Amino acid sequence: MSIPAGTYLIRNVESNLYLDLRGSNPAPGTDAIVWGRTGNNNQRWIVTTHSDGTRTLETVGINSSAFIATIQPGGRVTGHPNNETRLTITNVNPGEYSISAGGLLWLANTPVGGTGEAVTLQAAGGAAQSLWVFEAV
Ligand SMILES: CC(=O)N[C@@H]1[C@@H](O)[C@@H](O)[C@@H](CO)O[C@@H]1O
């Protein structure tokens, strides 16, 4: 009930937008946003699996992972060259998954006013309001 290891493109099903790194900056504190499909190196994510059943995402080329400093109901998702975060990617529908970090689900946060917004954690409600599709590249 989890995605296998490998390189994928993650797409949000609620708005048909792809997970992207803002500006391709290889610096700490770079927001992970949702943006239109371009297929560049900042939109391809390598999924690596661990022993306990958790998986991590790394950007291709830039080599910036997905790092959440404080796992709280309202924290953002950023990119760090060294530090990482162990995610849980479970299956709710055939084809559509859901990603959580420390028990809190993710959120879409579609861009408003021509500016992307960082993916933010969701409060403990248990209802997956955002599902992701892992298209093989
Ligand atoms: C090629 C490239 O880096 N594209 C990025 C895009 O991914 C997105 O981050 C945008 C932010 O508004 O800034 C650039 O256009």
Short mmCIF file of N, CA, C and O and ligand atoms in Angstrom, two decimals:
data_model
loop_
_atom_site.label_atom_id
_atom_site.label_comp_id
_atom_site.label_asym_id
_atom_site.label_seq_id
_atom_site.Cartn_x
_atom_site.Cartn_y
_atom_site.Cartn_z
N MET A 1 0.83 -1.20 0.00
CA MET A 1 0.00 0.00 0.00
C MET A 1 0.86 1.26 0.00
O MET A 1 0.55 2.24 0.67
N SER A 2 1.96 1.22 -0.76
CA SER A 2 2.86 2.36 -0.85
C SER A 2 3.54 2.36 -2.21
O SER A 2 3.61 1.33 -2.89
N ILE A 3 4.03 3.53 -2.60
CA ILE A 3 4.66 3.68 -3.91
C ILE A 3 6.03 3.00 -3.89
O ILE A 3 6.70 3.01 -2.84
N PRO A 4 6.47 2.37 -4.97
CA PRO A 4 7.82 1.80 -5.02
C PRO A 4 8.86 2.88 -5.28
O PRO A 4 8.54 4.01 -5.66
N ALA A 5 10.12 2.52 -5.06
CA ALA A 5 11.23 3.44 -5.25
C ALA A 5 11.42 3.77 -6.73
O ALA A 5 11.11 2.96 -7.61
N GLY A 6 11.93 4.97 -6.99
CA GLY A 6 12.17 5.38 -8.37
C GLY A 6 11.85 6.84 -8.64
O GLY A 6 11.45 7.56 -7.73
N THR A 7 12.03 7.28 -9.88
CA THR A 7 11.82 8.69 -10.22
C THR A 7 10.41 8.89 -10.74
O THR A 7 9.94 8.14 -11.61
N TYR A 8 9.72 9.90 -10.22
CA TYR A 8 8.31 10.13 -10.50
C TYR A 8 8.04 11.62 -10.64
O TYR A 8 8.84 12.47 -10.24
N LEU A 9 6.89 11.92 -11.24
CA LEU A 9 6.30 13.25 -11.24
C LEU A 9 5.03 13.22 -10.41
O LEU A 9 4.14 12.39 -10.67
N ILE A 10 4.93 14.10 -9.42
CA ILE A 10 3.80 14.11 -8.50
C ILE A 10 2.82 15.19 -8.95
O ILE A 10 3.20 16.36 -9.10
N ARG A 11 1.57 14.80 -9.17
CA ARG A 11 0.54 15.71 -9.64
C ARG A 11 -0.64 15.71 -8.68
O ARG A 11 -1.08 14.66 -8.21
N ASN A 12 -1.16 16.90 -8.38
CA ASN A 12 -2.34 17.03 -7.54
C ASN A 12 -3.59 16.80 -8.36
O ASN A 12 -3.77 17.40 -9.43
N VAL A 13 -4.48 15.93 -7.87
CA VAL A 13 -5.68 15.59 -8.62
C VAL A 13 -6.77 16.64 -8.48
O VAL A 13 -7.65 16.73 -9.35
N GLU A 14 -6.75 17.45 -7.42
CA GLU A 14 -7.80 18.44 -7.21
C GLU A 14 -7.66 19.64 -8.14
O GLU A 14 -8.66 20.29 -8.46
N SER A 15 -6.44 19.95 -8.58
CA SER A 15 -6.22 21.12 -9.41
C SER A 15 -5.33 20.87 -10.62
O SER A 15 -5.03 21.82 -11.35
N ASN A 16 -4.89 19.63 -10.86
CA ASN A 16 -4.05 19.29 -12.01
C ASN A 16 -2.77 20.12 -12.05
O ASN A 16 -2.38 20.65 -13.09
N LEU A 17 -2.12 20.23 -10.90
CA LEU A 17 -0.88 20.98 -10.76
C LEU A 17 0.21 20.08 -10.19
O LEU A 17 -0.06 19.17 -9.40
N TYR A 18 1.44 20.34 -10.61
CA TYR A 18 2.58 19.50 -10.28
C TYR A 18 3.40 20.11 -9.15
O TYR A 18 3.52 21.33 -9.03
N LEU A 19 3.98 19.24 -8.32
CA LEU A 19 4.84 19.69 -7.24
C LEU A 19 6.15 20.23 -7.81
O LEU A 19 6.78 19.59 -8.66
N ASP A 20 6.55 21.42 -7.35
CA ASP A 20 7.67 22.14 -7.94
C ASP A 20 8.47 22.81 -6.84
O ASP A 20 7.95 23.10 -5.76
N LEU A 21 9.75 23.05 -7.11
CA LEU A 21 10.63 23.78 -6.21
C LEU A 21 10.75 25.22 -6.71
O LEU A 21 11.07 25.45 -7.88
N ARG A 22 10.49 26.17 -5.82
CA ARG A 22 10.38 27.57 -6.21
C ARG A 22 11.72 28.10 -6.69
O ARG A 22 12.64 28.30 -5.89
N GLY A 23 11.84 28.34 -7.99
CA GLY A 23 13.00 28.98 -8.56
C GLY A 23 14.21 28.09 -8.75
O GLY A 23 15.25 28.58 -9.20
N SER A 24 14.11 26.80 -8.42
CA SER A 24 15.22 25.85 -8.51
C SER A 24 16.41 26.27 -7.66
O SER A 24 17.55 25.91 -7.98
N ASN A 25 16.18 27.02 -6.60
CA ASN A 25 17.27 27.49 -5.75
C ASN A 25 17.78 26.35 -4.88
O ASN A 25 16.99 25.75 -4.14
N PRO A 26 19.07 26.02 -4.93
CA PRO A 26 19.62 24.98 -4.04
C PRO A 26 20.08 25.56 -2.70
O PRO A 26 21.24 25.41 -2.30
N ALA A 27 19.17 26.22 -2.01
CA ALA A 27 19.45 26.86 -0.74
C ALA A 27 18.41 26.45 0.30
O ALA A 27 17.27 26.15 -0.06
N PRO A 28 18.79 26.43 1.58
CA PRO A 28 17.81 26.09 2.62
C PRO A 28 16.69 27.11 2.68
O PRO A 28 16.90 28.31 2.46
N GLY A 29 15.48 26.64 2.97
CA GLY A 29 14.33 27.51 3.09
C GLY A 29 13.67 27.85 1.77
O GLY A 29 13.14 28.94 1.60
N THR A 30 13.71 26.91 0.82
CA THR A 30 13.08 27.09 -0.48
C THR A 30 11.72 26.41 -0.47
O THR A 30 11.63 25.19 -0.29
N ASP A 31 10.66 27.19 -0.67
CA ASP A 31 9.31 26.68 -0.56
C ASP A 31 9.00 25.69 -1.69
O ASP A 31 9.40 25.90 -2.84
N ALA A 32 8.29 24.63 -1.35
CA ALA A 32 7.79 23.67 -2.32
C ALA A 32 6.35 24.04 -2.67
O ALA A 32 5.46 23.97 -1.82
N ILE A 33 6.13 24.42 -3.93
CA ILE A 33 4.84 24.95 -4.36
C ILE A 33 4.20 24.01 -5.37
O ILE A 33 4.77 22.96 -5.70
N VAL A 34 3.02 24.37 -5.85
CA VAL A 34 2.36 23.67 -6.95
C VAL A 34 2.31 24.61 -8.15
O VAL A 34 1.92 25.77 -8.02
N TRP A 35 2.73 24.10 -9.30
CA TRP A 35 2.88 24.91 -10.50
C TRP A 35 2.52 24.09 -11.72
O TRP A 35 2.41 22.86 -11.66
N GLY A 36 2.33 24.77 -12.85
CA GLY A 36 1.99 24.09 -14.08
C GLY A 36 3.11 23.19 -14.56
O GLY A 36 4.27 23.34 -14.18
N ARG A 37 2.74 22.24 -15.42
CA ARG A 37 3.70 21.25 -15.88
C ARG A 37 4.75 21.88 -16.79
O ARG A 37 4.42 22.58 -17.75
N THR A 38 6.02 21.63 -16.48
CA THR A 38 7.12 22.07 -17.32
C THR A 38 8.05 20.90 -17.62
O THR A 38 8.68 20.85 -18.68
N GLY A 39 8.12 19.94 -16.69
CA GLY A 39 8.96 18.77 -16.88
C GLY A 39 10.44 19.01 -16.69
O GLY A 39 11.24 18.20 -17.17
N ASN A 40 10.82 20.07 -16.00
CA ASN A 40 12.23 20.40 -15.82
C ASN A 40 12.82 19.54 -14.71
O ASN A 40 12.21 18.58 -14.23
N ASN A 41 14.04 19.87 -14.28
CA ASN A 41 14.73 19.07 -13.27
C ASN A 41 14.20 19.32 -11.86
O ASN A 41 14.49 18.52 -10.96
N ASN A 42 13.46 20.40 -11.65
CA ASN A 42 12.92 20.71 -10.33
C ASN A 42 11.56 20.09 -10.08
O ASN A 42 10.98 20.31 -9.01
N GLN A 43 11.02 19.32 -11.03
CA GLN A 43 9.73 18.68 -10.87
C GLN A 43 9.82 17.16 -10.84
O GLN A 43 8.79 16.50 -10.65
N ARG A 44 11.01 16.58 -11.00
CA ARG A 44 11.20 15.14 -10.94
C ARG A 44 11.74 14.76 -9.57
O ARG A 44 12.75 15.31 -9.13
N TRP A 45 11.07 13.82 -8.91
CA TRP A 45 11.40 13.45 -7.54
C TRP A 45 11.75 11.98 -7.46
O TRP A 45 10.99 11.13 -7.94
N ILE A 46 12.89 11.68 -6.86
CA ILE A 46 13.32 10.31 -6.59
C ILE A 46 12.77 9.89 -5.24
O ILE A 46 12.98 10.57 -4.23
N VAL A 47 12.05 8.76 -5.22
CA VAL A 47 11.47 8.20 -4.01
C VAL A 47 12.35 7.05 -3.56
O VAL A 47 12.54 6.07 -4.31
N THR A 48 12.89 7.16 -2.35
CA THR A 48 13.71 6.13 -1.74
C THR A 48 13.01 5.58 -0.51
O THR A 48 12.51 6.34 0.32
N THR A 49 12.98 4.25 -0.40
CA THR A 49 12.26 3.57 0.67
C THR A 49 13.22 3.14 1.77
O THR A 49 14.38 2.80 1.52
N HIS A 50 12.73 3.17 3.01
CA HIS A 50 13.50 2.79 4.18
C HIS A 50 12.99 1.46 4.73
O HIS A 50 12.05 0.86 4.20
N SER A 51 13.60 0.99 5.82
CA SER A 51 13.28 -0.33 6.36
C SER A 51 11.93 -0.34 7.05
O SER A 51 11.13 -1.27 6.86
N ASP A 52 11.64 0.67 7.87
CA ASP A 52 10.43 0.66 8.68
C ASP A 52 9.17 0.88 7.85
O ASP A 52 8.07 0.57 8.33
N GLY A 53 9.29 1.39 6.63
CA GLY A 53 8.13 1.61 5.79
C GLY A 53 7.88 3.07 5.48
O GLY A 53 6.75 3.46 5.17
N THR A 54 8.92 3.89 5.57
CA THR A 54 8.84 5.31 5.27
C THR A 54 9.68 5.62 4.04
O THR A 54 10.66 4.93 3.75
N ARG A 55 9.30 6.68 3.33
CA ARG A 55 9.92 7.02 2.06
C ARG A 55 10.26 8.50 2.02
O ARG A 55 9.62 9.32 2.67
N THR A 56 11.30 8.82 1.24
CA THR A 56 11.80 10.18 1.13
C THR A 56 11.90 10.59 -0.33
O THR A 56 12.13 9.75 -1.21
N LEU A 57 11.75 11.89 -0.57
CA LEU A 57 11.78 12.46 -1.91
C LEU A 57 13.00 13.36 -2.07
O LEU A 57 13.30 14.17 -1.18
N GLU A 58 13.69 13.22 -3.19
CA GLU A 58 14.85 14.05 -3.50
C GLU A 58 14.73 14.62 -4.91
O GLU A 58 14.34 13.91 -5.84
N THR A 59 15.06 15.90 -5.06
CA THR A 59 15.02 16.52 -6.38
C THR A 59 16.14 15.96 -7.26
O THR A 59 17.23 15.65 -6.80
N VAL A 60 15.84 15.84 -8.55
CA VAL A 60 16.80 15.34 -9.53
C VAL A 60 17.70 16.48 -9.97
O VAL A 60 17.22 17.54 -10.39
N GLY A 61 19.01 16.27 -9.87
CA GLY A 61 19.97 17.28 -10.30
C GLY A 61 20.29 18.29 -9.22
O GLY A 61 21.44 18.44 -8.82
N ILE A 62 19.26 19.00 -8.74
CA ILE A 62 19.45 19.96 -7.66
C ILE A 62 19.83 19.24 -6.37
O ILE A 62 20.60 19.75 -5.56
N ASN A 63 19.28 18.04 -6.16
CA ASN A 63 19.55 17.22 -4.98
C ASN A 63 19.14 17.93 -3.70
O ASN A 63 19.89 18.02 -2.73
N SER A 64 17.91 18.45 -3.70
CA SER A 64 17.31 19.08 -2.53
C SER A 64 16.10 18.26 -2.11
O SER A 64 15.18 18.06 -2.91
N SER A 65 16.10 17.80 -0.86
CA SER A 65 15.05 16.93 -0.37
C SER A 65 13.85 17.76 0.09
O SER A 65 13.79 18.98 -0.11
N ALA A 66 12.87 17.11 0.71
CA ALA A 66 11.71 17.77 1.29
C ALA A 66 11.88 17.77 2.80
O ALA A 66 11.88 16.70 3.43
N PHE A 67 12.02 18.95 3.39
CA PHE A 67 12.36 19.10 4.80
C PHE A 67 11.33 19.99 5.48
O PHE A 67 11.06 21.10 5.02
N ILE A 68 10.77 19.50 6.58
CA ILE A 68 9.87 20.26 7.44
C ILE A 68 10.56 20.46 8.78
O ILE A 68 10.84 19.49 9.48
N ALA A 69 10.84 21.72 9.12
CA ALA A 69 11.59 22.01 10.34
C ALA A 69 10.81 21.59 11.58
O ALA A 69 11.28 20.77 12.37
N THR A 70 9.61 22.15 11.76
CA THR A 70 8.74 21.81 12.88
C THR A 70 7.48 21.15 12.34
O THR A 70 6.78 21.73 11.51
N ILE A 71 7.20 19.94 12.81
CA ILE A 71 6.03 19.18 12.37
C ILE A 71 4.88 19.58 13.29
O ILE A 71 4.66 18.98 14.35
N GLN A 72 4.15 20.60 12.89
CA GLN A 72 3.03 21.15 13.65
C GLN A 72 1.88 21.42 12.69
O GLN A 72 2.09 21.53 11.48
N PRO A 73 0.65 21.53 13.21
CA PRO A 73 -0.49 21.79 12.32
C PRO A 73 -0.47 23.19 11.75
O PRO A 73 -1.14 24.10 12.26
N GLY A 74 0.29 23.38 10.67
CA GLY A 74 0.42 24.68 10.05
C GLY A 74 1.81 24.97 9.52
O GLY A 74 2.05 26.02 8.92
N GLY A 75 2.73 24.04 9.74
CA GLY A 75 4.08 24.21 9.22
C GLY A 75 4.14 24.03 7.71
O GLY A 75 3.30 23.36 7.11
N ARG A 76 5.15 24.64 7.10
CA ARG A 76 5.33 24.58 5.66
C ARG A 76 6.23 23.41 5.29
O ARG A 76 6.74 22.68 6.14
N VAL A 77 6.42 23.22 3.98
CA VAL A 77 7.33 22.22 3.44
C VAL A 77 8.37 22.93 2.61
O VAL A 77 8.03 23.71 1.71
N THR A 78 9.65 22.67 2.90
CA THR A 78 10.74 23.37 2.23
C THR A 78 11.75 22.38 1.65
O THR A 78 11.52 21.17 1.66
N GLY A 79 12.87 22.90 1.16
CA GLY A 79 13.91 22.06 0.60
C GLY A 79 15.27 22.31 1.21
O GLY A 79 15.76 23.44 1.21
N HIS A 80 15.90 21.25 1.74
CA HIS A 80 17.19 21.37 2.38
C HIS A 80 18.21 20.47 1.68
O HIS A 80 17.91 19.32 1.38
N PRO A 81 19.42 20.98 1.42
CA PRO A 81 20.42 20.15 0.73
C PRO A 81 20.82 18.90 1.49
O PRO A 81 21.12 17.88 0.86
N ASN A 82 20.84 18.94 2.82
CA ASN A 82 21.32 17.83 3.63
C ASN A 82 20.20 17.15 4.41
O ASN A 82 20.02 15.93 4.29
N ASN A 83 19.45 17.90 5.21
CA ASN A 83 18.43 17.30 6.06
C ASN A 83 17.25 16.79 5.23
O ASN A 83 16.99 17.25 4.12
N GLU A 84 16.53 15.83 5.80
CA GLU A 84 15.41 15.18 5.13
C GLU A 84 14.27 15.03 6.12
O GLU A 84 14.32 15.53 7.25
N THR A 85 13.22 14.34 5.68
CA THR A 85 12.09 13.99 6.53
C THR A 85 11.48 12.70 6.01
O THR A 85 11.28 12.55 4.80
N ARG A 86 11.20 11.77 6.91
CA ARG A 86 10.65 10.47 6.54
C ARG A 86 9.14 10.60 6.39
O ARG A 86 8.43 10.85 7.37
N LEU A 87 8.66 10.42 5.17
CA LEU A 87 7.25 10.56 4.84
C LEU A 87 6.56 9.21 4.78
O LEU A 87 7.19 8.16 4.61
N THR A 88 5.24 9.23 4.93
CA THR A 88 4.39 8.06 4.77
C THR A 88 3.44 8.31 3.61
O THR A 88 2.62 9.23 3.67
N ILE A 89 3.56 7.50 2.56
CA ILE A 89 2.75 7.65 1.35
C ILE A 89 1.83 6.44 1.29
O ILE A 89 2.24 5.35 0.87
N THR A 90 0.58 6.62 1.70
CA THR A 90 -0.38 5.53 1.73
C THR A 90 -1.35 5.65 0.55
O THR A 90 -1.40 6.66 -0.15
N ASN A 91 -2.13 4.59 0.35
CA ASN A 91 -3.05 4.49 -0.78
C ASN A 91 -4.49 4.57 -0.28
O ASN A 91 -4.87 3.83 0.64
N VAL A 92 -5.28 5.45 -0.88
CA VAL A 92 -6.69 5.56 -0.56
C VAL A 92 -7.59 5.12 -1.72
O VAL A 92 -8.65 4.54 -1.48
N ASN A 93 -7.19 5.38 -2.96
CA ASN A 93 -7.90 4.99 -4.16
C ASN A 93 -6.91 4.35 -5.12
O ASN A 93 -5.70 4.56 -5.00
N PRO A 94 -7.39 3.56 -6.08
CA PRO A 94 -6.47 2.97 -7.06
C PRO A 94 -5.89 4.02 -7.99
O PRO A 94 -6.59 4.52 -8.88
N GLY A 95 -4.62 4.36 -7.79
CA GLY A 95 -3.98 5.38 -8.59
C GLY A 95 -3.64 6.63 -7.80
O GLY A 95 -2.62 7.27 -8.05
N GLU A 96 -4.49 6.98 -6.84
CA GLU A 96 -4.33 8.19 -6.04
C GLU A 96 -3.81 7.82 -4.66
O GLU A 96 -4.35 6.91 -4.01
N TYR A 97 -2.79 8.53 -4.21
CA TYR A 97 -2.16 8.31 -2.92
C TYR A 97 -2.37 9.52 -2.01
O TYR A 97 -3.04 10.49 -2.37
N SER A 98 -1.79 9.44 -0.81
CA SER A 98 -1.81 10.55 0.13
C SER A 98 -0.53 10.52 0.95
O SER A 98 -0.12 9.46 1.43
N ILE A 99 0.09 11.69 1.10
CA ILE A 99 1.39 11.83 1.75
C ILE A 99 1.18 12.53 3.09
O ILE A 99 0.51 13.57 3.16
N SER A 100 1.76 11.96 4.15
CA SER A 100 1.70 12.55 5.48
C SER A 100 3.08 12.52 6.11
O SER A 100 3.92 11.67 5.78
N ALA A 101 3.32 13.47 7.01
CA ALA A 101 4.61 13.61 7.69
C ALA A 101 4.35 13.71 9.19
O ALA A 101 3.87 14.75 9.67
N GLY A 102 4.68 12.65 9.93
CA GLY A 102 4.49 12.67 11.36
C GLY A 102 3.05 12.57 11.82
O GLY A 102 2.74 12.94 12.95
N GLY A 103 2.15 12.09 10.96
CA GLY A 103 0.75 11.96 11.29
C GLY A 103 -0.14 13.06 10.74
O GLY A 103 -1.37 12.92 10.80
N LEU A 104 0.44 14.13 10.20
CA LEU A 104 -0.32 15.24 9.65
C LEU A 104 -0.26 15.19 8.13
O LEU A 104 0.82 15.05 7.55
N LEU A 105 -1.42 15.31 7.49
CA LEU A 105 -1.51 15.24 6.04
C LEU A 105 -1.07 16.55 5.40
O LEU A 105 -1.02 17.61 6.05
N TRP A 106 -0.76 16.49 4.11
CA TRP A 106 -0.34 17.66 3.35
C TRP A 106 -1.56 18.41 2.83
O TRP A 106 -2.71 18.02 3.06
N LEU A 107 -1.31 19.51 2.12
CA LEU A 107 -2.38 20.32 1.57
C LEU A 107 -1.94 20.88 0.22
O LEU A 107 -0.74 20.96 -0.07
N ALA A 108 -2.92 21.25 -0.60
CA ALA A 108 -2.63 21.69 -1.96
C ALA A 108 -2.03 23.09 -1.98
O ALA A 108 -0.90 23.29 -2.43
N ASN A 109 -2.79 24.08 -1.49
CA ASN A 109 -2.37 25.48 -1.48
C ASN A 109 -2.05 25.97 -2.89
O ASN A 109 -0.91 26.29 -3.23
N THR A 110 -3.09 26.01 -3.72
CA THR A 110 -2.94 26.44 -5.11
C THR A 110 -2.51 27.91 -5.17
O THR A 110 -2.86 28.70 -4.29
N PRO A 111 -1.76 28.29 -6.20
CA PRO A 111 -1.30 29.68 -6.29
C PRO A 111 -2.46 30.66 -6.44
O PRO A 111 -3.48 30.36 -7.05
N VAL A 112 -2.27 31.85 -5.86
CA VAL A 112 -3.25 32.93 -5.94
C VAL A 112 -2.54 34.21 -6.35
O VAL A 112 -1.46 34.52 -5.83
N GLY A 113 -3.13 34.93 -7.29
CA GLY A 113 -2.54 36.18 -7.75
C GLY A 113 -1.22 36.02 -8.46
O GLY A 113 -0.33 36.87 -8.31
N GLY A 114 -1.06 34.95 -9.23
CA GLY A 114 0.18 34.73 -9.96
C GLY A 114 1.39 34.52 -9.08
O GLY A 114 2.48 35.01 -9.40
N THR A 115 1.22 33.81 -7.97
CA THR A 115 2.32 33.54 -7.06
C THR A 115 2.05 32.23 -6.33
O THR A 115 0.99 32.07 -5.72
N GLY A 116 3.01 31.31 -6.39
CA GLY A 116 2.83 30.02 -5.74
C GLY A 116 2.86 30.13 -4.23
O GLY A 116 3.37 31.09 -3.64
N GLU A 117 2.30 29.11 -3.59
CA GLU A 117 2.24 29.03 -2.13
C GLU A 117 2.83 27.70 -1.68
O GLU A 117 2.63 26.67 -2.33
N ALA A 118 3.54 27.73 -0.56
CA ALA A 118 4.19 26.54 -0.04
C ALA A 118 3.16 25.53 0.46
O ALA A 118 2.11 25.90 1.00
N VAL A 119 3.48 24.25 0.29
CA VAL A 119 2.63 23.19 0.80
C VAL A 119 2.67 23.20 2.32
O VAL A 119 3.75 23.20 2.93
N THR A 120 1.49 23.20 2.95
CA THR A 120 1.38 23.30 4.39
C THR A 120 0.74 22.03 4.95
O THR A 120 -0.08 21.39 4.29
N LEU A 121 1.13 21.68 6.17
CA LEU A 121 0.56 20.52 6.84
C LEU A 121 -0.88 20.80 7.28
O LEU A 121 -1.27 21.95 7.50
N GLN A 122 -1.66 19.74 7.40
CA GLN A 122 -3.06 19.82 7.77
C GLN A 122 -3.26 19.35 9.20
O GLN A 122 -2.51 18.51 9.70
N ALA A 123 -4.27 19.91 9.86
CA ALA A 123 -4.58 19.54 11.23
C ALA A 123 -5.05 18.09 11.30
O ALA A 123 -5.39 17.46 10.29
N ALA A 124 -5.07 17.55 12.52
CA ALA A 124 -5.45 16.16 12.73
C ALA A 124 -6.95 15.98 12.58
O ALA A 124 -7.70 16.05 13.56
N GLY A 125 -7.41 15.76 11.34
CA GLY A 125 -8.82 15.54 11.08
C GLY A 125 -9.11 14.15 10.57
O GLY A 125 -10.20 13.61 10.79
N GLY A 126 -8.15 13.56 9.87
CA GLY A 126 -8.28 12.22 9.34
C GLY A 126 -8.89 12.13 7.95
O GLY A 126 -8.93 11.03 7.38
N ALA A 127 -9.36 13.24 7.39
CA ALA A 127 -9.97 13.27 6.07
C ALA A 127 -8.95 13.81 5.08
O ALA A 127 -8.56 14.98 5.16
N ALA A 128 -8.52 12.97 4.14
CA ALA A 128 -7.54 13.37 3.13
C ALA A 128 -8.20 14.31 2.13
O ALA A 128 -9.01 13.88 1.30
N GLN A 129 -7.87 15.60 2.21
CA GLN A 129 -8.42 16.60 1.32
C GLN A 129 -7.55 16.88 0.10
O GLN A 129 -7.89 17.75 -0.70
N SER A 130 -6.44 16.16 -0.05
CA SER A 130 -5.55 16.35 -1.19
C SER A 130 -4.89 15.02 -1.52
O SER A 130 -4.24 14.42 -0.66
N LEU A 131 -5.06 14.56 -2.76
CA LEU A 131 -4.50 13.30 -3.22
C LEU A 131 -3.53 13.55 -4.36
O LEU A 131 -3.70 14.48 -5.15
N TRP A 132 -2.50 12.71 -4.44
CA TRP A 132 -1.42 12.88 -5.39
C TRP A 132 -1.27 11.65 -6.27
O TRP A 132 -1.52 10.52 -5.83
N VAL A 133 -0.87 11.87 -7.51
CA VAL A 133 -0.65 10.82 -8.50
C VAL A 133 0.82 10.82 -8.88
O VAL A 133 1.38 11.88 -9.20
N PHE A 134 1.45 9.65 -8.85
CA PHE A 134 2.87 9.48 -9.13
C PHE A 134 3.01 8.91 -10.54
O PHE A 134 2.94 7.70 -10.75
N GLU A 135 3.20 9.80 -11.52
CA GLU A 135 3.38 9.38 -12.90
C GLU A 135 4.84 9.03 -13.16
O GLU A 135 5.74 9.83 -12.87
N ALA A 136 5.08 7.84 -13.69
CA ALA A 136 6.45 7.43 -14.01
C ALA A 136 7.01 8.27 -15.14
O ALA A 136 6.32 8.57 -16.12
N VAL A 137 8.27 8.66 -15.01
CA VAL A 137 8.93 9.49 -16.01
C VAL A 137 9.99 8.68 -16.74
O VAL A 137 10.05 8.69 -17.97
C1 LIG B 1 12.84 26.48 -15.06
C2 LIG B 1 12.41 27.07 -13.72
O1 LIG B 1 13.21 27.18 -12.84
N1 LIG B 1 11.04 27.48 -13.51
C3 LIG B 1 10.62 28.06 -12.21
C4 LIG B 1 9.30 27.47 -11.84
O2 LIG B 1 9.49 26.05 -11.53
C5 LIG B 1 8.69 28.13 -10.67
O3 LIG B 1 9.46 27.80 -9.49
C6 LIG B 1 8.64 29.65 -10.81
C7 LIG B 1 8.17 30.23 -9.53
O4 LIG B 1 7.26 31.25 -9.81
O5 LIG B 1 9.97 30.22 -11.15
C8 LIG B 1 10.57 29.58 -12.33
O6 LIG B 1 9.82 29.91 -13.44
#
